[PDB]
């Protein structure tokens, strides 16, 4: 089915790095909506923002794509639901779904791991099979 890949990057303490979230194996009907939660360590990584990738084609991306960061709860949340009304702004190709901007606070491994998945449906509102690969910063 669909494979969601949390990227693996390296960076120095005090620098801000970008951790890509990849969508692999996007079906022919596409992906009209999805939501999922990732876990992280706020003592290791300070996540300052999340941006939509190029596979989100909505000219007003905030209408279809939104996120939230909770350091006290040690989680980040993604919400995608294409806002065309017709299925026009659905994800149809593989690539970067989102980019996590994080400032490295310590040399320890900064794991960004899959926690929970909600909906993940195509344009026919059929829920797709999905699997997650964990990643993060300095985890190799």
């Amino acid at each position: 089915g669909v494979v969601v890949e949390i990227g693996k990057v390296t960076g120095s303490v005090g620098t801000t790095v970008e951790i890509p979230v990849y969508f692999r194996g996007v079906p022919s009907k596409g992906i009209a909506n999805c939501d999922f939660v990732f876990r992280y360590d706020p003592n290791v990584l300070e996540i300052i923002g999340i941006d939509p990738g190029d596979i989100i084609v909505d000219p007003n991306p905030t209408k279809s794509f939104d996120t939230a960061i909770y350091p006290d709860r040690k989680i980040i949340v993604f919400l995608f639901a294409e806002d065309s009304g017709t299925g026009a702004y659905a994800i149809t190709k593989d690539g970067v779904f989102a980019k996590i901007r994080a400032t490295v606070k310590s040399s320890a491994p900064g794991y960004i791991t899959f926690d929970e998945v909600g909906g993940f449906a195509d344009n026919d509102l059929v829920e797709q099979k999905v699997s997650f690969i964990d990643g993060g910063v300095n985890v190799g």
Binding site: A32, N33, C34, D35, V37, D66, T67, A68, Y70, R73, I75, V77, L79, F80, A81, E82, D83, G85, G118, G119, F120, A121, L125, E127
Partner: protein, 56 residues
């Protein structure tokens, strides 16, 4: 669709639903049932898509 249960389905319901999925807020047990648009036992992005399309 009527998340808050005030008798009208509008933008306020979608905002509450989207914030709930993004885990910014919690919904009460009554509101949870009404937020479950497709009635599959979970409140997620599929409900968000359906409600947003209903309003549009």
């Amino acid at each position: 669709g009527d998340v808050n249960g005030d008798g009208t389905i509008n933008s306020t319901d979608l905002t509450m639903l989207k914030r709930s999925v993004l885990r910014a807020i919690t919904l009460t047990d009554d509101a949870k049932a009404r937020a479950d648009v497709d009635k599959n036992g979970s409140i997620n992005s599929t409900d968000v898509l359906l409600l947003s399309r209903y309003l549009l």
